[PDB]
Design an enzyme around this catalytic site. Structure first.
Site, short mmCIF file in Angstrom:
data_model
loop_
_atom_site.label_atom_id
_atom_site.label_comp_id
_atom_site.label_asym_id
_atom_site.label_seq_id
_atom_site.Cartn_x
_atom_site.Cartn_y
_atom_site.Cartn_z
N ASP A 119 61.97 40.52 27.79
CA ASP A 119 62.37 40.44 29.20
C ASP A 119 63.05 41.72 29.70
O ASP A 119 64.22 41.97 29.39
CB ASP A 119 63.26 39.21 29.42
CG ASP A 119 63.70 39.03 30.87
OD1 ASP A 119 63.06 39.58 31.80
OD2 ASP A 119 64.70 38.32 31.09
N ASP A 125 59.41 44.01 35.76
CA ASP A 125 59.97 42.85 35.06
C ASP A 125 58.97 42.02 34.27
O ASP A 125 58.21 41.23 34.85
CB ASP A 125 60.71 41.96 36.06
CG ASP A 125 61.48 40.85 35.40
OD1 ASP A 125 61.65 40.87 34.16
OD2 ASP A 125 61.93 39.94 36.13
C1 LIG Z 1 65.03 40.68 40.58
C2 LIG Z 1 65.29 40.23 39.14
C3 LIG Z 1 64.45 39.01 38.73
C4 LIG Z 1 64.96 38.40 37.41
C5 LIG Z 1 64.10 37.19 37.00
C6 LIG Z 1 64.55 36.67 35.63
C7 LIG Z 1 65.21 35.44 35.61
C8 LIG Z 1 65.66 34.91 34.40
C9 LIG Z 1 66.33 33.69 34.36
C10 LIG Z 1 66.76 33.17 33.13
C11 LIG Z 1 67.44 31.95 33.07
C12 LIG Z 1 68.80 31.97 32.74
C13 LIG Z 1 69.53 30.79 32.66
C14 LIG Z 1 68.90 29.57 32.92
C15 LIG Z 1 67.55 29.54 33.25
C16 LIG Z 1 66.81 30.72 33.32
C17 LIG Z 1 65.32 30.62 33.69
C18 LIG Z 1 66.53 33.89 31.96
C19 LIG Z 1 65.87 35.11 32.00
C20 LIG Z 1 65.43 35.62 33.22
N1 LIG Z 1 64.79 36.80 33.26
C21 LIG Z 1 64.35 37.33 34.41
N2 LIG Z 1 63.72 38.50 34.36
C22 LIG Z 1 66.44 38.01 37.59
O1 LIG Z 1 66.76 37.15 38.42
N3 LIG Z 1 67.30 38.69 36.83
C23 LIG Z 1 68.77 38.50 36.94
C24 LIG Z 1 69.44 37.68 35.83
C25 LIG Z 1 69.29 38.32 34.45
C26 LIG Z 1 70.12 37.53 33.41
C27 LIG Z 1 69.74 36.04 33.38
C28 LIG Z 1 69.75 35.41 34.78
C29 LIG Z 1 68.92 36.24 35.78
#
Ligand SMILES: CCC[C@H](Cc1cc2cc(-c3ccccc3C)ccc2nc1N)C(=O)NCC1CCCCC1
Length: 369
Positions: A34, A219
């Site tokens: 990721d 991403d």
């Molecule tokens: C513009 C950026 C899009 C990108 C999408 C993305 C969401 C995610 C969400 C989780 C996640 C965490 C807890 C519970 C449930 C889920 C599904 C894990 C991994 C994730 N990985 C990702 N790439 C994003 O929102 N990143 C910011 C944060 C990074 C750290 C974890 C929370 C999200």
């Protein structure tokens, strides 16, 4: 780098994972790749969905950091206990490093039922690490403690999907033609700037500032090509107009329902190529990446979902984009490289393309502040 080729696995819409070991003796886990997050987090309790989990009591090299993490997301969350341990990548470089590990002890809507992964490898920068930028991400740790060069590359291909994560280098057999680089605007997410968007060869006419509001990122953790609200509205409007041979309900474009033609009667040529122009390495110079409908129309277990959607996070260049190209995360030179993937799915007609140079003025004006 033949060692590291084909070391990624996954199912249709549940991300790409790599095999990792953690602790002494090593405990094998499948870990999601990721580039949109920065934490290394693994299941550490017997959640019903998990094939396996990190057993800290079993590892002589585990050190407790006596510190907790609550990580909420739009929907769902995970909570964990911070510590460090010996981490290795069997089908990666021949090294072992002490990295931070979040041992997940409580979660909601994080683990997928049926999935074959047990954790997540956040490859982005320290700034977006939870709880703060003092928790060093795995890759930063890797580079500091070893002689592995500060870069990695991803070739995401695709029931089961596959690919390659080349750690510390590039394997030229994974791409055709030439790599073009766009600069990483700032080291938090892998931020890039889009300077122009064309559909089937025709500009959207929008102020490029709105292509990057408030972010544009690369991403591997996101499935769709996510576009900002206004950009999405203009894009689909143009994609609808481009494909008028057939008509589909207003809900299909919003990804609220499904479209079906069986027998293998898929008329790709009705659907337009999408093109993104990205800021180049040189002043006033850009290049373009072009994706086929076979990238934004993914099969669902013949039926397809429209894989372009709204976002108040900005433009997210997810698997829809990345599956067309070999993507080089050149951290050492603050740049991201795109080249046509050797494994991307094309037909006998059109292909995915990486072309340049182009002349584009006022590219800095496209970044939001
Ligand atoms: C513009 C950026 C899009 C990108 C999408 C993305 C969401 C995610 C969400 C989780 C996640 C965490 C807890 C519970 C449930 C889920 C599904 C894990 C991994 C994730 N990985 C990702 N790439 C994003 O929102 N990143 C910011 C944060 C990074 C750290 C974890 C929370 C999200």
């Amino acid at each position: 780098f033949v060692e590291m080729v084909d070391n990624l696995r996954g199912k249709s819409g549940q991300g790409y994972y790599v095999e990792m070991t953690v602790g002494s003796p090593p405990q094998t886990l499948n870990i999601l790749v990721d580039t949109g997050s920065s934490n290394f987090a693994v299941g550490a309790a017997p959640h019903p969905f998990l094939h396996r989990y990190y057993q800290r009591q079993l590892s002589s090299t585990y050190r407790d950091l006596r510190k907790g993490v609550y990580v909420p997301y739009t929907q769902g969350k995970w909570e964990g206990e911070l510590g460090t341990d010996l981490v290795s990548i069997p089908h990666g470089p021949n090294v072992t490093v002490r990295a931070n590990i979040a041992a997940i002890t409580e979660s909601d809507k994080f683990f997928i039922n049926g999935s074959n992964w047990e954790g997540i490898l956040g490859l982005a920068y320290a700034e977006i690490a939870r709880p703060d930028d003092s928790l060093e991400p795995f890759f930063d740790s890797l580079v500091k403690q070893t002689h592995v060069p500060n870069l990695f590359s991803l070739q995401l291909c695709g029931a089961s999907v596959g690919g390659s994560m080349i750690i510390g280098g590039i394997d030229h057999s994974l791409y055709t033609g030439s790599l073009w680089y766009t600069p990483i605007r700032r080291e938090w997410y892998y931020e890039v700037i889009i300077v122009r968007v064309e559909i089937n060869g025709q500009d959207l006419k929008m102020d490029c500032k709105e292509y990057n509001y408030d972010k544009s990122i690369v991403d591997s953790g996101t499935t769709n090509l996510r576009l900002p609200k206004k950009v999405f509205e203009a894009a689909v409007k143009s994609i609808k107009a481009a494909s008028s041979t057939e008509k589909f309900p207003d809900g299909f474009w919003l990804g609220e329902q499904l479209v079906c033609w069986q027998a293998g009667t898929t008329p790709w040529n009705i659907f337009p190529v999408i093109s993104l122009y990205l800021m180049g390495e040189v002043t006033n110079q850009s290049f373009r990446i072009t994706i086929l409908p076979q990238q934004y129309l993914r099969p669902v277990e013949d039926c397809y979902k429209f894989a372009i959607s709204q976002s108040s996070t900005g433009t997210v260049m997810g698997a829809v984009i990345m599956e067309g190209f070999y993507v080089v995360f050149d951290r050492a030179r603050k740049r991201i490289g795109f080249a046509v993937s050797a494994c991307h799915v094309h037909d006998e007609f059109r292909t995915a393309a990486v072309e340049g140079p182009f002349v584009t003025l006022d590219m800095e004006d496209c970044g939001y502040n």
